[PDB]
Structure 1
Amino acid sequence: GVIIKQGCLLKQGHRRKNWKVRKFILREDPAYLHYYDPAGAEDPLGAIHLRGCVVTSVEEENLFEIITADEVHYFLQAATPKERTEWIKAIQMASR
């Protein structure tokens, strides 16, 4: 799978609804969005199978959400609206 996009974002705790910085790597052959420790561990902390996902902005600034085909929800926060828009479209093209 080839790398499409790469960057850090704030991801909301599924858990206690907290927010944490993670490094995200979007790939396209296999449609996947992996997240790691904000550091340099390339062994992922989780994976998001993107095939058939739904990704939309959420009206905390620059929020957007990912809904997997089986309805697991991911809440992310970009640093700027331009970044958010870029991630959303990238994720959309990847799960083609």
Structure 2
Amino acid sequence: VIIKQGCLLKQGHRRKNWKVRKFILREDPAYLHYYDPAGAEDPLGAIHLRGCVVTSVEENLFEIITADEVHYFLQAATPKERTEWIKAIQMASR
């Protein structure tokens, strides 16, 4: 069951550039998979949300810090979309 999907920009870890990715949030277990919007069917990666912390912080930025301390910086297109994503991620992290 897919709780939420949509696109966000995601910042790279070393080079700080922002790329559009499609995100799919699932809840049992809680994963945020992300995919190249124009490319491969296979996911590029997945974020394990159990125990993560998400915070509002370019604008409409927010950050996820996972249980193993990885930081992901994301940017929504509007403040409303940021608010919705943060709320959905928090709920799924429980």
Pairwise TM-score range, normalised by the shorter structure: over 0.9
Percent identical residues: 100
Q: SS in structure 2 opposite 1:89?
A: helix
Question: How far off is 1:84 after superposition?
Answer: 0.1
Matching residue of 1:73: 71
CA–CA distance in 1 between the matches of 2:41 and 2:88? 21
Q: TM-score, normalised by structure 1?
A: 0.94
Q: Deviations over 1:16-57 (max 9, x none)?
A: 011000000000011000000012533110110000000000
Q: SS in structure 2 opposite 1:16?
A: coil
CA–CA distance in 1 between the matches of 2:40 and 2:34? 10
Runs (4+) of structure 1 exceeding 2 A deviation are 39-42
Provide the aligned length of Structure 1 versus Structure 2. Answer: 94
Structure 2: state its 5+ residue gaps: none
Q: TM-score, normalised by structure 2?
A: 0.96
Structure 1: state its 5+ residue gaps: none
